[PDB]
Amino acid sequence: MIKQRTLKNIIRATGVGLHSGEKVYLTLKPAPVDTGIVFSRTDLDPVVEIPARAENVGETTMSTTLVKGDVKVDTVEHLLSAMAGLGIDNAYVELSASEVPIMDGSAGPFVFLIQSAGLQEQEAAKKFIRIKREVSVEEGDKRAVFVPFDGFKVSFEIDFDHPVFRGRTQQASVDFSSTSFVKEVSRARTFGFMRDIEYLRSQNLALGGSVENAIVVDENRVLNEDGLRYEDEFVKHKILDAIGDLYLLGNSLIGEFRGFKSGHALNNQLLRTLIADKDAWEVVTFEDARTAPISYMRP
Ligand SMILES: CN1CCN(Cc2ccc(C#Cc3ccc(-c4cc(C(=O)NO)cnc4-n4cnc5ccccc54)cc3)cn2)CC1
Ligand SMILES: [Zn+2]
Known part of the structure; x- marks a missing residue:
């Protein structure tokens, strides 16, 4: 099991x-x-x-x-x-x-x-919590969706403020069946644009922030000496946040999450809507790991 x-x-x-x-x-x-x-x-x-x-x-x-x-x-x-x-x-x-x-x-x-x-x-x-039916929440151009999927998959698209690496947007899809969380997601760092950081610090926010714990971009250039850990580190960090926010459900998900310019607020609203919509999900256990749709690394 x-x-x-x-x-x-x-x-x-x-x-x-x-x-x-x-x-x-x-x-x-x-x-x-x-x-x-x-x-x-x-x-x-x-x-x-x-x-x-x-x-x-x-x-x-x-x-x-x-x-x-x-x-x-x-x-x-x-x-x-x-x-x-x-x-x-x-x-x-x-x-x-x-x-x-x-x-x-x-x-x-x-x-x-x-x-x-x-x-x-x-x-x-x-x-585990299996997604049986699609559940979505929207607010303006922001969207967060759960879709039935036999495993665990996360897709994310972000809009920048703007533009970064010739793009105003960045997208990534990670299917946790073939790609490990440790290898492809875990190392993606949080980030902030200098214009936003100056505003946050003026309001006594982001006090512990530094180039040692965040990617700093002054408009279109990464200021961190050693650059990025992944070419798409920004969207990989948003995927990292979504996984953490989704874990507040209290059990691992069997399904697909798709985020469209979604943050912590909408991620939590999606969880609240799923919890409330009892017909869209069910608790499942696997007495046989070999046939389970999600695999964890050996202990
Ligand atoms: C020339 N130097 C460079 C070094 N500076 C020091 C420095 C370096 C980094 C930071 C920072 C930062 C920071 C702030 C917020 C976030 C952030 C994290 C999360 C997060 O990771 N959640 O999981 C979500 N949102 C964030 N955020 C980023 N921009 C925002 C704008 C508005 C609101 C939130 C914002 C990330 C890094 C501050 N000062 C001084 C000048
Ligand atoms: Zn984060």
Whole structure:
């Protein structure tokens, strides 16, 4: 059977929040069967727990934020994309500040941290959500869609502001059956245009941002000394964010996601519409991994 997975050991990372600029201690702790991903704010009394669920999504302007009252956990998507990518179902994520550290701006360091701690397969079937019918949400020219597909596939098209590498747009499609999350997506870094960055910094935002954790483009030129990790790194990072945002469903998806100039807000609205449309999905387990439509790497 395709089993649930957690970490073999507790592992720690240190970093800075992209938006808050605050130093943060990150602890990933193994968790038992059917826990899901649960975040906790350890710098607070009492300690506040926030399950990584679509219903707990608050702000979506700068990154995906989880909320419980006045308590927030900011920028959960890169860490969640790394967990989705590796098939981590159960884990405690303990943070000493509101924001998850940005690391190098990609899911790469989180994927390596998880693999360094080692994966632990658990004696219970991993639950998947199968897309049975198409579900879509739109707002103006933005669109996010789930389409039935026997596996997991992500397509994304973005519009720039503008234009970058002779194009006003960038597109990429990743079918996770033939292409691995680790190889083709995990290393794609977050990005910002200098004109936007100057505005964000003037408003005390993007405080932890630097060329060490973000691609900076001054109009049409990448300013980072060593350039890009992928020719289409921008759209690959949007795919990385969509995977993380989609993981807030609480279980891995069997289906195809298509994003058209979609961000954190519309990604969460798509999840809310899918959850509400119970006839469009069903929970499925695979007692035989050999015939399952999604494959995870050996533990
Ligand atoms: C000449 N130097 C170059 C180095 N500078 C320092 C520097 C370097 C990088 C940054 C930065 C940044 C940054 C800000 C926001 C994002 C961002 C991340 C996510 C994200 O990854 N979510 O997962 C989503 N949206 C983002 N975003 C980018 N532009 C935006 C404009 C408006 C709103 C949000 C915006 C990414 C990088 C700031 N200062 C000083 C001048
Ligand atoms: Zn991102």
